[PDB]
Amino acid sequence: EFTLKTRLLAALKGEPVDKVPVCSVTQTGIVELMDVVGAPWPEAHTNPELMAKLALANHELSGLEAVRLPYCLTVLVEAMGCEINMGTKNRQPSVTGHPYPKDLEGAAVPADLLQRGRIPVVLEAIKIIREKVGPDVPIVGGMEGPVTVASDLVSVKSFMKWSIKKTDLLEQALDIATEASIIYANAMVEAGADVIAIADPVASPDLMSPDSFRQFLKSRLQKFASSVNSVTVLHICGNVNPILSDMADCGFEGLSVEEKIGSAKKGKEVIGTRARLVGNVSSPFTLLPGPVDKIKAEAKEALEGGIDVLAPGCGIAPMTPLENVKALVAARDEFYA
Ligand SMILES: [Mg+2]
Ligand SMILES: [Zn+2]
């Protein structure tokens, strides 16, 4: 007698379950569903009712066993003072202006952070989702993680340069970013999110050295996971093998990883008992192009490999067909006959 909610939480914590849940902890907005239910980007980023409507659509039509919102990695950084290009129907919002590119004078978490930007759109959409689906479906709150938030406060160019030349500034930014991150994450929990999933691409070995991850980044990610009042998941895009074992020490229940790093079996060997593994079906090379049977085959492989929560490896590409998302769920059902 698991519910979708109780199973997800049990899975992520490593407690026994009847079967692996199938859902996404990464963004679920797809153009096919934007068209069906009339909730296109960018308006689905700015209006809580359309945000709700599109999230629910990739639950109710796809069979993914959670509702995930929002669709972008800019809500918090914008509330922190970044300027955002809101993008288009298939191009996600992106940061164009950084509030503290040359120094951190005056940089703080604003006392009224939660009223700023689109924070109130996300909190309201969570409440709308909860009211519609009820207590037995889990709500995953997505956000940019503290490394990426720090990098957006100061520009990635300043962030990289300070990492070598002004580590005090690097650390001050990381500290403000972590504080803001915890505040927003807890707000999503208070609004009704069951899992907080952070996406922190700047922490990737593709952008920051593994040595820098261990020296500066790990401690902030540890502080986040410890201070946030829910089950959490850490997603770091890219070739994360050189830090996978360090990720597993950060205190997140789950780690969300891309197909790129190898098999689920291999990932489980690295992380051991320290965290669970969420993933890993390739968003750009399997889920987006299909075909359906290739998605089911790679799903099956992750399940056999011991994945804890079957999911896309990264955010779903916006042009992913609905039937390709449904092929994930079908693979899971098939595994259990
Ligand atoms: Mg397991
Ligand atoms: Zn990713």
From TrEMBL:
<feature type="binding site">
    <location>
        <position position="235"/>
    </location>
    <ligand>
        <name>Zn(2+)</name>
    </ligand>
</feature>
<feature type="binding site">
    <location>
        <position position="237"/>
    </location>
    <ligand>
        <name>Zn(2+)</name>
    </ligand>
</feature>
<dbReference type="InterPro" id="IPR006360">
    <property type="entry name" value="Mtase_MtaA_CmuA"/>
</dbReference>
<dbReference type="GO" id="GO:0046872">
    <property type="term" value="F:metal ion binding"/>
</dbReference>
<dbReference type="GO" id="GO:0006730">
    <property type="term" value="P:one-carbon metabolic process"/>
</dbReference>
<dbReference type="GO" id="GO:0015948">
    <property type="term" value="P:methanogenesis"/>
</dbReference>
<protein>
    <submittedName>
        <fullName>Methylcobalamin: Coenzyme M methyltransferase</fullName>
    </submittedName>
</protein>
<keyword id="KW-0489">Methyltransferase</keyword>
<dbReference type="InterPro" id="IPR000257">
    <property type="entry name" value="Uroporphyrinogen_deCOase"/>
</dbReference>
<feature type="modified residue" description="Cysteine sulfinic acid (-SO2H)">
    <location>
        <position position="72"/>
    </location>
</feature>
<keyword id="KW-0479">Metal-binding</keyword>
<feature type="binding site">
    <location>
        <position position="314"/>
    </location>
    <ligand>
        <name>Zn(2+)</name>
    </ligand>
</feature>
<feature type="binding site">
    <location>
        <position position="308"/>
    </location>
    <ligand>
        <name>Mg(2+)</name>
    </ligand>
</feature>
<dbReference type="InterPro" id="IPR052024">
    <property type="entry name" value="Methanogen_methyltrans"/>
</dbReference>
<feature type="domain" description="Uroporphyrinogen decarboxylase (URO-D)">
    <location>
        <begin position="4"/>
        <end position="334"/>
    </location>
</feature>
<dbReference type="GO" id="GO:0006779">
    <property type="term" value="P:porphyrin-containing compound biosynthetic process"/>
</dbReference>
<dbReference type="Pfam" id="PF01208">
    <property type="entry name" value="URO-D"/>
</dbReference>
<dbReference type="GO" id="GO:0004853">
    <property type="term" value="F:uroporphyrinogen decarboxylase activity"/>
</dbReference>
<keyword id="KW-0808">Transferase</keyword>
<keyword id="KW-0862">Zinc</keyword>
<feature type="binding site">
    <location>
        <position position="92"/>
    </location>
    <ligand>
        <name>coenzyme M</name>
    </ligand>
</feature>
<dbReference type="GO" id="GO:0008168">
    <property type="term" value="F:methyltransferase activity"/>
</dbReference>
<keyword id="KW-0484">Methanogenesis</keyword>
<dbReference type="InterPro" id="IPR038071">
    <property type="entry name" value="UROD/MetE-like_sf"/>
</dbReference>
<dbReference type="GO" id="GO:0032259">
    <property type="term" value="P:methylation"/>
</dbReference>
<feature type="binding site">
    <location>
        <position position="27"/>
    </location>
    <ligand>
        <name>coenzyme M</name>
    </ligand>
</feature>
